[PDB]
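Quick one:
INPUT:
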């Protein structure tokens, strides 16, 4: 008992005993031991060792160093050793591995809780936490002596934690890159955005049903911002004739920048410069005519350098180089487009001939026209057809003998020939969605109250020009084929009555067009959705769940909601904004007396019932720091129940990156994180935990719970 030899024997035996606690269990039963039993046997061994060392030193002699080196050998193998090689520190490493393995299972279950609630922010955070665990902290699992023990940890705990992670690869990839693409365009780096969108595009097809809706919007939103915020570009240059060329832009150009100074033209492969005389821009701003002093040479290519141009309201163009090749066309035939001409003081005869090459292709420009007429010519191209029945016009191509000959043309006053457009409009916006109540939604889904709902028609005359100055309800009229469904006034005014489909028709005398207009059923309450599956709160505390109301399509339906508890003795309940107002409410439940009840969310005809069970929670056992940027410190009992709140009393400390200050609204206190690292949450002199910030986004550090470093 007292004799050293006995102390050493038993210490040796007890140190191995602690290792047998786990290893014999796994081998013989295929089950893990109680972790309490392992900890007990572990702490008993550490004491047994320490007592033995003390006893051996007390006795001394030659047997001292033999006993000491032997005891240490067992201890460093079976029990504990800092930085152990495989086979050493057996119990200590198993404790670390079992604690890590169960933590992975808890993390796997927390991730699945978010995947079911369709929460994407919480799922991504938990994905990133466990991706680190599965790849970096897997080293803990590798330290375990016992192949059976190592495998049973993997199978029981890691396998399902790995499998859930790997089926979520694509969902997070898309959510990451779409955020990165949105962040690139804000920083003004377009090369990152296109690389990110390419990666988004290839992986959206593979995402799970868990976030498919929210991810699809996220993907398209990243595309939409990229299209809008993209550099304006000179598309092409192309010749018009021997002295002018057309330039097309991707975006509408600023008139002030479209000036000769900014256009530099050279003969390609030479230093022969051609100076511009003028720049004329189209009314849209997508094309421009650049005219030159010098004559382009038939067959030759030309280099157009474009500096210092600008977008309409927007930003600068890329200094671009674009080429064009001048090719003098060869006219062969010429023809009047109609047997008739409009009535007008000045009829531009050039607009009424078509020129062709011998192949039969139209020649849009390049040539010059000479005219003779029965009528007097102004600027060699305009004639006066007013009051006339017919005219003779002879069109020749200047240098050529290509001629129409004398052609007799009827004069015909402009009349409606075709209905160029017919659409339902409100406040000059084209409407896509219309309800029988009256509300009209545009191409995206943004309804307008200003402007009255009418029909809009434009018409083209027999010469294919738009008819101007024409009044709805006078020159042309609108009517309905289904008056019970939809009512149309002569001018086009619409007042719909019942959902369905009505055929609407316009007429300018004999010219007509018929368009169908579908009127959708009035928005009605379909679904009352609840944020929380079941509410568990401490007696004398509050809990919040969000109530969202839906219509039959899947949009925000505005409505009144009254909420009631079964028993005010066990739980009392209240709703935000008196129950009136919005489509999206938050509901507060207060604990009164331990037990169970159910809550009733009522709206008009439909209802959803939510379980509420209040607990009389125990004393303060822990303090949680939560991120909800805003920040809170919760007092929490043994069960995880939030009982008490000490965001107040607590202090936060650490060129300084972040501003931090105490902030109170009504009574609820919150700490706020601003900008110009790691912060330290303290209560008195005690440190409660650390928070890591990044340059905006913050997460609370989880403490090192390992028995071995690295």
């Amino acid at each position: 008992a007292t004799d050293v030899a006995t102390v050493v024997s038993q210490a040796k035996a007890q140190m191995k005993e602690a290792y047998y606690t786990y290893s014999h269990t796994v081998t013989e039963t295929g089950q893990f031991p109680d972790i309490k039993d392992v900890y007990a046997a572990y702490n008993k061994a550490k004491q047994a060792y320490a007592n033995a060392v003390a006893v051996v030193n007390k006795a001394g002699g030659a047997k001292k160093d033999a006993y000491l080196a032997d005891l240490q050998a067992i201890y460093e193998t079976y029990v504990f050793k800092a930085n152990p090689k495989s086979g050493e520190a057996r119990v200590a490493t198993y404790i670390d591995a079992y604690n890590y393995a169960t933590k992975l299972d808890k993390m796997r279950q927390e991730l699945k809780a978010a995947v079911d609630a369709k929460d994407l922010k919480k799922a991504e955070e938990l994905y990133h936490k466990i991706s680190y665990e599965l790849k970096t902290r897997t080293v803990i699992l590798d330290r375990v002596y016992g192949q059976s023990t190592r495998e049973l940890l993997r199978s029981t705990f890691k396998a399902d934690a790995q499998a859930l992670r790997d089926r979520l690869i694509y969902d997070i990839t898309v959510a990451m890159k779409a955020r990165e693409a949105q962040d690139a365009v804000k920083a003004g780096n377009l090369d990152k955005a296109k690389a990110a969108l390419d990666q988004v595009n290839q992986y959206v097809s593979k995402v799970t049903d868990a976030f498919k809706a929210e991810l699809q919007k996220a993907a398209q939103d990243a595309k939409a911002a990229y299209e809008a915020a993209l550099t304006p570009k000179v598309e092409s240059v192309s010749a018009i004739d021997s002295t002018s060329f057309k330039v097309t832009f991707t975006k509408p150009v600023d008139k002030a920048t479209a000036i000769p100074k900014n256009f530099s033209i050279t003969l390609k492969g030479t230093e022969t410069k051609l100076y511009p005389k003028s720049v004329e821009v189209s009314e849209s701003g997508l094309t421009a005519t650049v005219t030159l002093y010098d004559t382009l040479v038939d067959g030759k290519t030309y280099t157009v350098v474009t500096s210092g141009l600008k977008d309409t309201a927007g930003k600068e163009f890329e200094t671009s180089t674009n080429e064009f090749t001048y090719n003098k066309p060869v006219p062969a035939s010429i023809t009047f487009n109609f047997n008739k001409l409009p009535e007008d003081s000045a009829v531009d005869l050039t607009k009424y001939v078509t020129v062709k090459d011998a192949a039969g292709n139209v020649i849009k420009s390049g040539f010059e026209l000479e005219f003779t007429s029965s009528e007097k010519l102004t600027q060699g191209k305009f004639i006066n057809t007013t009051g006339k029945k017919s005219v003779i016009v002879n069109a020749t191509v200047k240098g050529t003998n290509v001629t129409t000959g004398n052609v007799i043309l009827a004069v015909e006053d402009e009349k409606a020939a075709e209905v160029s457009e017919l659409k339902l409009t409100k406040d000059n916006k084209e409407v896509v969605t219309l309800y029988a109540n009256g509300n009209a939604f545009d191409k995206d889904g943004n309804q307008i109250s200003s402007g009255t709902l009418t029909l809009t028609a434009k018409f083209k005359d027999q010469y294919g020009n738009e008819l101007t100055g024409k009044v709805a309800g006078t020159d042309y009229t609108f009517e309905s084929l289904n008056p019970e469904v939809l009512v149309v006034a002569p001018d086009g005014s619409v007042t719909p009555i019942v959902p369905g489909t009505a055929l609407v028709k316009v007429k300018y005398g004999e010219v007509t067009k018929t368009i169908p207009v579908t009127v959708k059923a009035n928005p009605v309450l379909e679904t009352i959705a609840v944020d929380s599956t079941g509410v568990s709160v401490a007696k004398g505390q509050k809990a919040t769940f969000k109530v969202t109301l839906k219509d039959q399509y899947g949009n925000k339906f505005t409505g009144n909601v009254n909420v009631t508890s079964d028993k005010t003795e066990t739980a009392t309940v209240s709703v935000s904004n008196s129950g009136i107002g919005q489509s999206e409410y938050t509901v507060t439940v207060n604990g009164v007396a331990e037990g169970s009840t159910t809550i009733t969310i009522k709206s008009g005809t439909k209802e959803v019932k939510v379980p509420v069970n209040v607990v009389a929670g125990g004393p303060v056992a822990n303090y949680q720091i939560k991120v909800l940027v805003q920040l809170k410190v919760y007092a929490v009992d043994a069960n995880g129940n939030i009982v008490g709140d000490i965001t107040n009393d607590v202090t936060i400390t650490s060129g300084v990156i972040v501003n931090a200050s105490k902030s109170t609204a009504n009574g609820d206190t919150v700490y706020v994180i601003t900008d110009n690292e790691t912060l330290t949450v303290k209560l008195g002199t005690v440190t409660l935990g650390t928070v890591d910030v990044e340059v905006l986004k913050a997460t609370v550090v989880t403490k090192k719970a390992d028995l071995i470093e690295l």
